[PDB]
Amino acid sequence: ARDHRKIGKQLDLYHMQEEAPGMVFWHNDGWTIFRELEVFVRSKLKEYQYQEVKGPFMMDRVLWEKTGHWDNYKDAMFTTSSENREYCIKPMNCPGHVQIFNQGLKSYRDLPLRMAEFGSCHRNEPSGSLHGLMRVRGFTQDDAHIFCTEEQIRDEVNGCIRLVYDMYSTFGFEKIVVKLSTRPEKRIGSDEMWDRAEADLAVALEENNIPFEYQLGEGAFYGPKIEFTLYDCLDRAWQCGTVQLDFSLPSRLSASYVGEDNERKVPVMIHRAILGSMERFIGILTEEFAGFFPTWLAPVQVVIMNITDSQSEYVNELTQKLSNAGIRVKADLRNEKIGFKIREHTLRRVPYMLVCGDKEVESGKVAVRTRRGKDLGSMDVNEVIEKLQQEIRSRSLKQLEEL
Amino acid sequence: RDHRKIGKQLDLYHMQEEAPGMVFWHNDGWTIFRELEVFVRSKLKEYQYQEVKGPFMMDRVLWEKTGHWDNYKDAMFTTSSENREYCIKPMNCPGHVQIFNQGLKSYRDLPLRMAEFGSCHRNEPSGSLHGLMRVRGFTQDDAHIFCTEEQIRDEVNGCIRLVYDMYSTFGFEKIVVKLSTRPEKRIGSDEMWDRAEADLAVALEENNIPFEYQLGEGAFYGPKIEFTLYDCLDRAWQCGTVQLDFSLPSRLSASYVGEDNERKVPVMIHRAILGSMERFIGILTEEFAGFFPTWLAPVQVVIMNITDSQSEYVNELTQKLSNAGIRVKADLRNEKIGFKIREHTLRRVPYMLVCGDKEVESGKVAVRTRRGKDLGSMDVNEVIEKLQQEIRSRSLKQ
Numbered sequence: 001a002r003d004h005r006k007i008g009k010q011l012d013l014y015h016m017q018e019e020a021p022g023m024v025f026w027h028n029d030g031w032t033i034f035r036e037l038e039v040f041v042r043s044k045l046k047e048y049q050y051q052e053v054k055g056p057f058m059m060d061r062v063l064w065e066k067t068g069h070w071d072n073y074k075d076a077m078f079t080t081s082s083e084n085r086e087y088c089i090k091p092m093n094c095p096g097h098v099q100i101f102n103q104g105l106k107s108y109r110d111l112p113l114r115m116a117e118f119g120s121c122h123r124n125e126p127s128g129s130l131h132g133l134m135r136v137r138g139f140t141q142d143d144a145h146i147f148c149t150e151e152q153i154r155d156e157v158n159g160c161i162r163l164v165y166d167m168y169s170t171f172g173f174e175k176i177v178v179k180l181s182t183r184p185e186k187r188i189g190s191d192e193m194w195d196r197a198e199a200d201l202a203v204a205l206e207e208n209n210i211p212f213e214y215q216l217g218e219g220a221f222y223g224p225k226i227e228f229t230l231y232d233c234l235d236r237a238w239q240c241g242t243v244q245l246d247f248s249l250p251s252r253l254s255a256s257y258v259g260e261d262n263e264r265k266v267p268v269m270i271h272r273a274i275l276g277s278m279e280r281f282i283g284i285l286t287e288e289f290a291g292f293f294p295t296w297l298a299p300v301q302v303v304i305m306n307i308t309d310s311q312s313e314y315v316n317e318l319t320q321k322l323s324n325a326g327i328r329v330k331a332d333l334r335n336e337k338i339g340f341k342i343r344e345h346t347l348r349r350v351p352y353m354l355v356c357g358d359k360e361v362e363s364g365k366v367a368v369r370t371r372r373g374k375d376l377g378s379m380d381v382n383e384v385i386e387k388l389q390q391e392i393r394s395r396s397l398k399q400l401e402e403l
Numbered sequence: 404r405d406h407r408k409i410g411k412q413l414d415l416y417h418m419q420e421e422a423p424g425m426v427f428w429h430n431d432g433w434t435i436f437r438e439l440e441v442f443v444r445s446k447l448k449e450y451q452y453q454e455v456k457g458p459f460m461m462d463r464v465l466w467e468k469t470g471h472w473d474n475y476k477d478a479m480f481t482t483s484s485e486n487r488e489y490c491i492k493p494m495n496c497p498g499h500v501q502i503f504n505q506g507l508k509s510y511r512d513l514p515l516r517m518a519e520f521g522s523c524h525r526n527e528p529s530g531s532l533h534g535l536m537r538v539r540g541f542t543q544d545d546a547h548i549f550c551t552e553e554q555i556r557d558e559v560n561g562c563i564r565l566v567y568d569m570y571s572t573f574g575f576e577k578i579v580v581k582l583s584t585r586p587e588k589r590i591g592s593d594e595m596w597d598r599a600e601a602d603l604a605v606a607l608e609e610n611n612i613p614f615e616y617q618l619g620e621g622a623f624y625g626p627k628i629e630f631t632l633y634d635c636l637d638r639a640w641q642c643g644t645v646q647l648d649f650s651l652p653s654r655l656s657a658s659y660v661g662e663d664n665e666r667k668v669p670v671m672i673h674r675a676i677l678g679s680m681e682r683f684i685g686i687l688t689e690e691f692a693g694f695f696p697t698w699l700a701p702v703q704v705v706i707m708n709i710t711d712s713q714s715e716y717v718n719e720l721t722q723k724l725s726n727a728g729i730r731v732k733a734d735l736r737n738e739k740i741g742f743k744i745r746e747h748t749l750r751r752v753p754y755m756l757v758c759g760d761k762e763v764e765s766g767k768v769a770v771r772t773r774r775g776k777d778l779g780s781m782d783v784n785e786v787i788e789k790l791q792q793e794i795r796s797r798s799l800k801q
């Protein structure tokens with residue numbers, strides 16, 4: 001079956017070792033993909049008007065007792081101690097986000113406050129359940145919590161729902177199934193609060209014309225969940241996105257704002273992650289493309305090769321020029337024959353391969369080749385640069401000219 | 404002027420007793436952090452560094468082999484899973500060596516320069532914590548350079564030049580250089596330390612760099628050049644560092660196929676330019692007294708109306724500047740114009756663009772700076788161009 005663990009070794013993306021179970025060593029080229037995904041999410045955070053923060057890796061166990069995590073996550077939480085106190089390594093970003101909200105006086109005028117983080121979390125998942133990038137102990141969530149009034153729930157859940165379909169469409173995921181995860185057996189909050197949170201999410205889905213199934217007893221301890229599963233090109237299901245309505249944690253953590261009539265009020269909190277674990281999302285993408293990443297995600301977008309020693313200076317000039325123009329480009333000046341070089345970069349799935357022989361030096365042009373074997377012939381360097389810039393800017397799925 | 408007070412006033416970050424020495428970065432402070440990462444990335448691109456990311460914890464067994472367990476125990480946070488013990492990472496070096504150890508390397512791959520914005524933790528004594536300067540959770544602009552004996556000079560020189568190159572951008576006038584020599588508890592022979600210490604002094608002298616000795620303060624694995632920066636009370640803080648390590652690669656089985664097909668162990672150079680991102684932000688906060696240069700300022704431009712009558716226009720320009728890459732916010736509040744100007748002056752926002760009825764007809768903007776200087780009427784294209792130029796060149800002034 002397509003396997004990201006094999007593709008990832010082939011393409012030198014990352015590795016794992018038993019010295020750090022379920023924790024990824026990101027090699028240069030894999031980290032390049034991770035960083036480009038973060039650039040993409042940030043573009044969406046800007047458009048959708050989110051803050052971006054960073055909360056600490058560890059906080060005192062007492063805070064985690066207060067939230068309800070200690071009772072409901074105890075087993076899954078890594079603990080460490082210093083000077084007679086115990087700290088939990090964070091399994092979730094939400095408590096940190098509340099501590100940031102709690103700094104200073106908040107007004108109804110500050111709401112809806114949308115707070116995002118690339119949140120680096122750890123959970124002590126059983127070793128026997130771990131699997132490549134898909135099931136890890138250290139994962140990074142494209143997380144956010146929205147602080148809002150009850151009157152704002154509708155519009156904010158809607159914005160989260162749009163964002164899911166918006167973002168998945170960029171990667172070519174258009175087949176999406178939705179579920180509503182209802183009250184678990186171990187939960188905090190009254191049944192009436194639950195009645196209300198569940199109906200709020202059902203109503204949002206209904207008004208969006210999104211059909212769903214129930215997922216009985218699978219909501220969070222703090223609130224119910226809209227869960228979004230995409231299907232890939234092999235029609236495999238991946239549950240990724242989550243939208244969660246929380247009437248419990250803010251009160252538990254003494255969060256408040258001053259309302260219009262100057263009465264003190266507790267905000268509602270919406271939790272959401274669209275990609276889920278970025279580690280897992282990269283694993284899925286690697287399998288979806290079978291290594292043929294779109295140019296905007298490809299770790300190396302262009303390799304420029306000499307025929308021999310003769311054209312080294314020209315290829316060096318070209319490499320520098322394309323790099324200044326923001327393309328991930330490298331020069332292959334090695335000993336070997338032209339066909340040894342192109343095979344190597346073809347198997348590395350580099351989008352474009354520029355060939356530079358004696359006649360290219362004198363014309364100021366490049367012979368352009370793709371990783372799917374297409375001969376794009378001689379091209380001017382400025383044309384090559386402009387078309388790649390356009391491909392990258394637009395985050396296009398396919399290369400030049402095809403169906 | 405204290406970074407801690409300024410931090411509160413500009414809403415950059417906070418700390419709490421629930422996590423001593425752990426920073427909560429608010430939006431505006433995280434903004435600064437992120438620009439610094441962009442800047443570091445630009446500088447390392449010209450030097451061909453890779454960028455990686457290693458795990459947050461690794462097995463105690465690995466930390467025993469590196470010598471951290473014996474030479475660094477009280478300073479490490481530990482945790483357990485399924486009866487195995489892990490240290491939360493105090494350093495990124497061992498993780499980088501694990502990546503180097505994947506795949507056969509040859510002399511052709513050297514020098515190999517491997518960088519990481521590495522989030523580490525050290526169990527610093529609580530009484531020694533001080534604001535952003537000394538924290539328990541820190542991020543280094545770290546790198547390790549894997550190289551041959553013959554390449555040490557060149558690569559140490561390259562690190563030294565990178566420190567003065569990057570520091571020139573912020574305009575530091577006082578950079579104190581210390582050479583830190585073998586500590587009491589250390590790994591490696593006295594002969595290795597003789598040769599390591601000599602290489603670093605030779606390198607300083609080759610660049611004609613005035614320096615002092617700081618005996619007994621080097622790392623357990625090797626000597627350190629330290630580039631020292633100073634806070635508003637003139638307290639010293641290590642920022643830049645360049646270190647020479649002939650120990651860890653052998654300890655961790657790193658090797659490469661030489662010129663003559665014999666196996667060799669590479670030399671490692673450790674270096675950080677800014678140091679800790681937290682400490683560096685502390686230093687920059689006091690250095691500039693909050694008036695961050697335009698390229699680093701969390702909000703570069705605030706656009707304000709007088710009344711609801713100009714809102715549409717303020718929104719028009721706010722989307723226009725934003726689309727040009729400028730960090731811009733609209734202030735649409737039913738507050739007096741002098742209340743608005745004072746908040747944004749206090750927040751140290753480089754530029755304030757005021758819009759009344761007059762500006763809506765003319766299609767211009769009234770421009771004022773956080774220094775209270777009146778810049779008069781300007782066209783929106785000239786303001787966009789001025790700013791893109793200040794941002795792109797990363798200028799210190801104006």
Ligand SMILES: C[C@@H](O)[C@H](N)C(=O)NS(=O)(=O)c1cccc(-c2ccc3n[nH]cc3c2)c1
Pocket residue numbers: 091092093094123125134135136137139141143144145242244271272273276277280
């Ligand atoms: C959405 C967040 O604000 C919420 N606080 C949360 O973590 N929800 S969640 O537990 O359902 C969640 C969301 C996304 C990812 C994960 C998660 C958790 C652990 C994992 N290991 N490998 C992949 C993993 C993914 C959990």
Ligand SMILES: C[C@@H](O)[C@H](N)C(=O)NS(=O)(=O)c1cccc(-c2ccc3n[nH]cc3c2)c1
Pocket residue numbers: 493494495496525527535536537538539541543545546547642644646673674675678679682
């Ligand atoms: C250069 C690195 O590769 C090296 N392995 C190292 O960690 N050297 S170092 O211990 O001297 C060092 C370098 C940079 C920052 C810190 C550091 C360490 C702990 C801190 N707490 N608050 C600010 C801190 C700064 C330590």
Ligand SMILES: [Zn+2]
Pocket residue numbers: 092093094145271272
């Ligand atoms: Zn959450």
Ligand SMILES: [Zn+2]
Pocket residue numbers: 494495496547673674
């Ligand atoms: Zn190091």
